[model samples]
Target: RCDPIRISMCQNLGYNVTKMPNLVGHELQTDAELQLTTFTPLIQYGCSSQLQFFLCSVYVPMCTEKINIPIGPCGGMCLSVKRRCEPVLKEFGFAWPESLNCSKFPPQNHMCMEGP
Candidate 1:
């Protein structure tokens, strides 16, 4: 019975290890195990050493600027606006979520459209 209990405890700790944010791609250490107890009182009181782990990781970087939608002819003016605005949009973490097909004017002709 004691052996089974120990194995269960170890398994629970292992499972909990994956849930920690800072522990991503890292192994749990003796210090971390102790600190984990201190980090959250709920985890401590729960008496169950299960860690919550996310199956997937997502990293969203900072954005820079708003993207410009084209307005006039599909050539030089639109391209120039896009070239100027793309870096700003990337820095600001903005993306074109909607299609510009509804507009009578080509997207490239406009200035910058504020992102939602």
Candidate 2:
């Protein structure tokens, strides 16, 4: 079952609620919110307009009765965000986290949302 997204940062995403055990395997919204905060700086920097959406898609995901599993951003979306944000992180002496690897996401044509 899906629950309304309690994470303040993710509330305004494309969907209002999300299912548990999200793409990153956070079973509770509190944990998801905690983990997502680590990326707040990147999001605040505005490296890419899609960064927040992309991160939220992975952390909270999209909830729907039609799909049995959680649906996050498509690989194309991940790549697009990564392409734009990686350099920004580099400038700050950071590297894109392995946890958000673009290759791990579903293909663009799969049951996933499109990118920017």
Candidate 3:
């Protein structure tokens, strides 16, 4: 919780009284734009195979814009790829940890979000 008057004063001066960035991110995309990709494989009702279901966007169908995290060598760093792709994973109802693992690249020049 926070003090009301102090919060109001900060708001008046365009400052965040909570001292935390009130950043909001991600919104759902259209079904038409949504295309699902997966690894290993699956049958009806997610019944098949290894890894079961997994994948991300070639077009990324998503983006949180280019955020300057100021901590890496990225024209668009690992964070950038993450910002763009993570929501696509969630929106499609795949699995969070599997899809989110998209951010880990092995030995690529550029960071690969979830390497093959």
Candidate 4:
């Protein structure tokens, strides 16, 4: 996501948009027709689109440090994302993957997941 807080805010709202894989300065664009009220995918800025309930929005902050947590098996190793990214994401409260295996994904890491 463009911002890190938005990822957590969305998470607090009940969605794990942070795990979208390669979501950095850009975020998962969410729409009224699309929404996840749980730990999963696809989240957007502004009041989340909902048919079952109501929502609202406000100024959202982003992590200039940015991160991209892959969801599943993709390609190959990346030295930049972690070596260059997480520093900022950490300041913004972004969580690091508990376990990592770069051989499984597009970059030097597998599909990275969020953890407590």
Candidate 5:
């Protein structure tokens, strides 16, 4: 089923509506919020302009009844943000988390979000 994106961190950004059992397998928005919060510092610090949107792509993922699978950021967008943001995370002795592996996302030709 689809729902309005309730994750405050992802609201009013690149996309709007969402579906659950998000890409990371979170079945509820609340659970997604808990995990998403851990990365708040990266976005807060403005690690990359696309960081928040990239995160949202997986956490809440764009939704519509037309498709059953979650739609998320494109691989190129993932790689782009990873390149820009991972270095900042490394500054704090953190590698980009495994959950956000760019290879997991679809290529640009698929129906996924792209970074500006």
Candidate 6:
């Protein structure tokens, strides 16, 4: 089991003022440091095959958040593909399923179309 980690940040401002400055003349300024604490969990397996099986069977979901200056788009499609392909990859050494097709959406390459 893994322990939950608490993330914290410390902000520093160069100037110390006795009272709140006028809004029109004051400019907000500060520096910040982010800290993260994590712990390693021990994983035990019965054998090499079991370890391989565990690794292969694991379905680690991809991150899906987009914010801040370095924004990242939602990875829903990539995660969906990974989830759909994991079992096939484990059983047949290939990720893509034979029956799965991706050629319906027009004007946008590699786009899956909505169908009934």
TM-score to true structure, per model: 0.22, 0.93, 0.21, 0.23, 0.91, 0.18
TM-score of candidate 5 on Cα atoms, chains taken together? 0.91
Against the reference, the lDDT scores of all candidates come to 0.26, 0.85, 0.27, 0.29, 0.85, 0.22
Q: Which stretches of candidate 4 lie over 4 Å from their true place?
A: 1-77, 97-103, 106-116
Task: Estimate, for each residue in 1-116, the C-alpha lDDT of model 2 and write its tens digit.
Answer: 77888899877677887898988776888898999898888888898998888888888888898888888999988898899999988998999998899888987856887753
lDDT for 40 in candidate 3 is 20
By TM-score, is 1 or 2 better? Answer: 2
lDDT of 6 by residue, 29-57 (tens): 11101101110011121212222111111
Better of 2 and 5 by TM-score: 2
Clash-forming residue pairs, model 3:
38-54, 43-48, 102-113, 102-114, 103-113, 103-114, 104-114
Tens digits of lDDT, candidate 1, 1-116: 00111112234321211222221222223433443342243333332222111111100111122322111122333244344444444665764212211232234323322121
lDDT of 2 at 98: 88
Shift of residue 36 alpha carbon in model 6, Å:
39
After superposing all C-alphas onto the true structure, candidate 2 shows an RMSD in angstroms of 1.3
Q: What value does the lDDT take at residue 15 in candidate 1?
A: 20
Candidate 1 lDDT at 63 equals 17
**Cα lDDT over the full model 6:** 0.22
- What is the clash count for each candidate, in the order shown? 20, 0, 7, 15, 0, 0
Which regions of candidate 3 fall more than 4 Å away from where they truly are? 1-76, 95-116
Q: Kindly list the per-residue Cα lDDT of model 4 for residues 6-107, writing each as its tens digit.
A: 423434532233332232222343531133252122123211233111111111211223543323322221232334333544666764333223333353
TM-score, candidate number 1 = 0.22
The sequence of per-residue lDDT tens digits that candidate 5 reaches over residues 1-116 is 77898878788875678988888987999999999889888888896888888888888898988987789889998898889899998888989888899888888956887873
Runs off by more than 4 Å, candidate 6: 1-73, 94-116
User: Which regions of candidate 2 deviate over 4 angstroms?
Assistant: none
